[PDB]
């Protein structure tokens, strides 16, 4: 409850400190959601970056 962590939160929160946008991550988070894969992530910036 008080410590309710939010790992979909934290996935955004991750890459937006590694140097990416947040339009960037967000967008591919929120078209891929809670599915995507630490590994799919990386690879839509590869590409769509």
């Given at each position: 409850g008080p410590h309710m962590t939010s790992e979909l939160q934290m996935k955004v929160d991750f890459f937006r400190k590694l140097g990416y946008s947040s339009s960037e991550i967000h967008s591919v988070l929120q078209k891929?959601?809670?599915?995507?894969d630490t590994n799919t992530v990386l690879g839509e910036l590869v590409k769509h970056g």
């Open positions: 891929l959601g809670v599915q995507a």
